[PDB]
Ligand binder design. Structure first.
Ligand SMILES: CC[C@@H]1C(=O)N(C)c2cnc(Nc3ccc(C(=O)NC4CCN(C)CC4)cc3OC)nc2N1C1CCCC1
Ligand SMILES: [Zn+2]
Length: 294
């Protein structure tokens, strides 16, 4: 049956982690709060049984995720704190993000206020700017892997579909996985690069401001059809400045979209209010951003 250890030992680093509260599954992984027995620090452990990694192609995908994520360090990227293995499991040690993800926020709040959307989108963009400048395309940016720490700071996570651009002008021809907010050039199998991440942020912005994703249908294949045909509409109550930026990012032609470095210079950010921080209450109650308290 094979059972997960209660204490996880890294023989190289000599660090031991006591397995705590179950957090949920993430793909092939069962995830847990894990705490270092010496420093008492808490991390999110991702635990993958090798019995699900029998195919070299699976191991290579798991290897590449680790290889990419371990190379990154940024305020808006999930912290990578180690990985190790025994004969039965791969153990990955990640930054624990105690407020889960924007997916759980979205399920509770639906459409956010515009300043909340600017706030989160700014941090998503800063993290993605960092990725692209280090030649990493994430390829799976979605509400569920945009994690939130205690301070409601965004941490981009789940590098399971990410890839490294190895040379200038390289077009990736293959994406082995099913991303949520999939760019049309991936779907049409015509070669893709960094612009797919800007498509996805486009979709995240729409979802954050509208309360639902732009191309949703009752069948994934019908969704793909719509994406390829660029069949979406922005509700009339969305402000023209926001709607303009969504439109720019959601263009069929990847070369037409803004690049990650242009986004924060958009009128959407520069001429609107961006809170310095959000109160914890924003997880459940719309903020009014009032100037003083009564
Ligand atoms: C490690 C994988 C991925 C990741 O990459 N990081 C960095 C991550 C960082 N932080 C967290 N944090 C929490 C995630 C879930 C919960 C939570 O409360 N889960 C409840 C458990 C019982 N269940 C009935 C209802 C859900 C609490 C978290 O922090 C206190 N999760 C992360 N995940 C997730 C772990 C499962 C899917 C993805
Ligand atoms: Zn494959």
């Amino acid at each position: 049956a094979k059972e997960i250890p209660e204490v996880l030992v890294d023989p190289r680093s000599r660090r031991r982690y006591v397995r705590g509260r179950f957090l949920g599954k993430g793909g092939f992984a069962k995830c847990f709060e894990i705490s270092d027995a010496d420093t008492k620090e808490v991390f999110a452990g991702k635990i993958v049984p090798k019995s699900l990694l029998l195919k070299p192609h699976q191991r290579e995908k798991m290897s590449m995720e680790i290889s990419i994520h371990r190379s990154l360090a940024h305020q808006h990227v999930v912290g990578f704190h180690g990985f190790f293995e025994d004969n039965d499991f791969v153990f990955v040690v990640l930054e624990l993000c105690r407020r889960r993800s924007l997916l759980e926020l979205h399920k509770r709040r639906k459409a956010l206020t515009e300043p909340e959307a600017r706030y989160y989108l700014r941090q998503i963009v800063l993290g993605c700017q960092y990725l692209h400048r280090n030649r990493v395309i994430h390829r799976d940016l979605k509400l569920g892997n945009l994690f939130l720490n205690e301070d409601l700071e965004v941490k981009i996570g789940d590098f399971g579909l990410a890839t490294k651009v190895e040379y200038d002008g390289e077009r990736k021809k293959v994406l082995c996985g099913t991303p949520n907010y999939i760019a049309p050039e991936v779907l049409s199998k015509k070669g893709h690069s960094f612009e797919v991440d800007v498509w996805s942020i486009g979709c995240i912005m729409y979802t954050l401001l509208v309360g639902k994703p732009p191309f949703e249908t009752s069948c994934l294949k019908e969704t793909y059809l719509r994406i390829k045909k660029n069949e979406y509409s922005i509700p009339k109550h969305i402000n023209p400045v926001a709607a303009s930026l969504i439109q720019k990012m959601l263009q069929t032609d990847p070369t037409a979209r803004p690049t990650i470095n242009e986004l924060l210079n958009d009128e959407f950010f520069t001429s609107g209010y961006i809170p310095a921080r959000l109160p914890i209450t924003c997880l459940t109650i719309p903020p009014r951003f009032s100037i003083a308290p009564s």
